[PDB]
C-alpha cells in the first residue's frame, strides 16, 4: 500500500549504505576484489540485516563490501549515479545525501582504509566524482541532489580536511558538514580535531549536523548543540532522557532526524518502548521521517513509512506536515526553498 504518495522529502541517506548488490558484485569481479558472496541475494544476506543488532555491528558490516568499490575512479561516479536512481524510485523530489570522502580512497588518507592500497585517489577527486554522479543523476531523474560531506568519529585527523572540502565544493554540491560513525567511543564527539574542523565551519558558513543522539546519551547530544553547534540534530533518540534539554530543543526549533526502520536495527531502540519518533509527532517537534542505510538495513523509503503507519499509527495528515518541515530545515538557500516549498506546498493542500 502506498503508504506515502505525495512528493516526499528526505534528509538521513548515506551513499556508503546506498548501493545496490549489483555493483558492489561487478567491481568485486571486475578489477578482481575478492568478495564475501556471489548469488546477488546472498550478497544482500551478508550484507544485510535482519535482527537487532549493535550500533558497533552494523558498522562493520560495512567492511565486508567497501573493499569492492574502494578506489576504482569509475565507481564514484557510478554508484552516485546509481542512487540518484533509487532516490526517484521511491518517492523524492530533494535530497540531501551524505558520505565520507575518507572511506573512499586509495591515495594521502595515512589510515588508508578497508584495508586496502596505494594510490591514484585523492579527497579532492572523489568528491568531484560525486558531484558530477549526482549532478548528473539530478540530470536525468527529477531529482535535485545535495550532499553532505562527514567528518568521521574515530578518525578526528581527516576533520579538518572536510571543511575545506564542504567550502569549497559549496552548492556544486555539498551544503553542509556532518559527525558520522560508532556514538559508543567515549569522548568523541567533542575531542579537538571535531571542534576545529565544525568551528572552521561555524566560522566559515558552512552548515552543520551531528549525529547524536542514536545508540548514545542525552549528553552527547547537549555536547553537540552546545559544542558543535549543530544546525539540525542526526537522529536525536536519546534527548528524550534530559527533559529540560528536551524543552529546550523543542523550544530553539530544530530539526531531528528520525530513521524509524533504522532505530529497531542498529540498537537504538527497545521494542518494548514506544520510539522516540511517535513522541516527537505527539509534542509536534520538526522531526523528518528517513532511510539512512537502504542497503545494510534491506529497506526502501516506503519501510519506515509503513513501519510507521502501520504499527505507530500516523495519519496521512501528520506525513503531510512532516514533509512539509523537512523541507523547511533543509540545507538549501531561501532562494531553491521558497521554490520547493511551492511544489509540495501545491500538491498537499
Ligand atoms: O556515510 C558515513 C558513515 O556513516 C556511518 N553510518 C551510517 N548511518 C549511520 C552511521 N553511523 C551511525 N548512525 C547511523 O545513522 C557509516 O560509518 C558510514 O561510513
Ligand atoms: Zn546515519
Redesign the pocket.
Known amino acids: 500500500t502506498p503508504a506515502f504518495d505525495k512528493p516526499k522529502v528526505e534528509l538521513?541517506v548515506?551513499?556508503?549504505?546506498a548501493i545496490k548488490p549489483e555493483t558492489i558484485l561487478y567491481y568485486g569481479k571486475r578489477r578482481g576484489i575478492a568478495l564475501p558472496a556471489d548469488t546477488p541475494e546472498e550478497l544482500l544476506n551478508i550484507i544485510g540485516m535482519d535482527k537487532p543488532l549493535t550500533?558497533p555491528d552494523?558498522?562493520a558490516k560495512?567492511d565486508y563490501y567497501m573493499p569492492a568499490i574502494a578506489g576504482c575512479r569509475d565507481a564514484i561516479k557510478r554508484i552516485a549515479y546509481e542512487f540518484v536512481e533509487m532516490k526517484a524510485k521511491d518517492g523524492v523530489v530533494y535530497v540531501e545525501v551524505?558520505?565520507?570522502p575518507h572511506?573512499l580512497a586509495n591515495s594521502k588518507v595515512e589510515p588508508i582504509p578497508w584495508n586496502q592500497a596505494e594510490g591514484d585517489l585523492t579527497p579532492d577527486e572523489v568528491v568531484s566524482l560525486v558531484n558530477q554522479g549526482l549532478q548528473e543523476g539530478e540530470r536525468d531523474f527529477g531529482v535535485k541532489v545535495r550532499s553532505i560531506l562527514?567528518c568521521?568519529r574515530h578518525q578526528p585527523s581527516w576533520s579538518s580536511e572536510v571543511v575545506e572540502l564542504c567550502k569549497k565544493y559549496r552548492e556544486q554540491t555539498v551544503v553542509a558538514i556532518?559527525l558520522?560513525?560508532?556514538?559508543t567511543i567515549e569522548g568523541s564527539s567533542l575531542f579537538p580535531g571535531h571542534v576545529q574542523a565544525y568551528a572552521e565551519a561555524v566560522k566559515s558558513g558552512v552548515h552543520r549536523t551531528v549525529?547524536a543522539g542514536?545508540?548514545g546519551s542525552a549528553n552527547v547530544v547537549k555536547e553537540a548543540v552546545d559544542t558543535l553547534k549543530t544546525e539540525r540534530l542526526?537522529?536525536g533518540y536519546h534527548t528524550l532522557e534530559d527533559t529540560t534539554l528536551y524543552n529546550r530543543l523543542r523550544q530553539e526549533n530544530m530539526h531531528f532526524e528520525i530513521?524509524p526502520w533504522?532505530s529497531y536495527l542498529?540498537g537504538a531502540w527497545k521494542p518494548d518502548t514506544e520510539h522516540a519518533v511517535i513522541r516527537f509527532k505527539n509534542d509536534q517537534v520538526n522531526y523528518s521521517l528517513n532511510t539512512?542505510?537502504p542497503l545494510?538495513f534491506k529497506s526502501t523509503l516506503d519501510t519506515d513509512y509503513q513501519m510507521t503507519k502501520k504499527d505507530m499509527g500516523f495519519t496521512e495528515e501528520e506525513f503531510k506536515r512532516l514533509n512539509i518541515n523537512a523541507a523547511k530545515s533543509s540545507f538549501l538557500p531561501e532562494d531553491e526553498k521558497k521554490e520547493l516549498l511551492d511544489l509540495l506546498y501545491k500538491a498537499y493542500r
Open positions: 538521513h548515506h551513499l556508503d549504505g550500533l552494523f558498522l560495512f551524505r558520505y565520507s572511506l562527514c568521521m556532518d558520522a560513525g560508532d556514538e549525529h542514536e545508540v542526526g537522529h530513521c533504522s542498529t539512512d542505510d545494510i
